[PDB]
């Protein structure tokens, strides 16, 4: 909505876990992930 891209750093769960978590909210994260409108890093 506000046109400010974002980065996510997860130190516990794998990125697909977050993706599936927000799947139900209609947020549809994978779309942004691969559109490069948002980023993820797993450590």
């Amino acid at each position: 909505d506000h046109g400010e891209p974002g980065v996510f750093v997860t130190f516990e769960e794998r990125p697909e876990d977050i993706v599936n978590n927000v799947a139900s909210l209609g947020f549809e994260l994978d779309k942004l992930i691969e559109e490069e409108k948002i980023a993820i890093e797993h450590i």
Binding site: E12, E13, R14, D17
Partner: protein, 52 residues
């Protein structure tokens, strides 16, 4: 992660002890769905209660 990779649904049992939600206190942050079971005595009668 080995179980997850092999496509396995895992369930684990842990104890509380003196307090907290887990014995070590941090296994709750190394799982995906935490359920707490209680057998509390109110007055003198015990009512078993489960929470997600």
């Amino acid at each position: 992660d080995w179980l997850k990779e092999r496509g396995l649904t895992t369930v684990i049992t842990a104890e509380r002890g003196d307090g907290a939600l887990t014995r070590q206190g941090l296994e709750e942050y190394v799982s995906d769905c935490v359920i707490l079971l209680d057998h509390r005595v109110e007055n003198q009668i015990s009512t078993r209660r489960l929470r997600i």
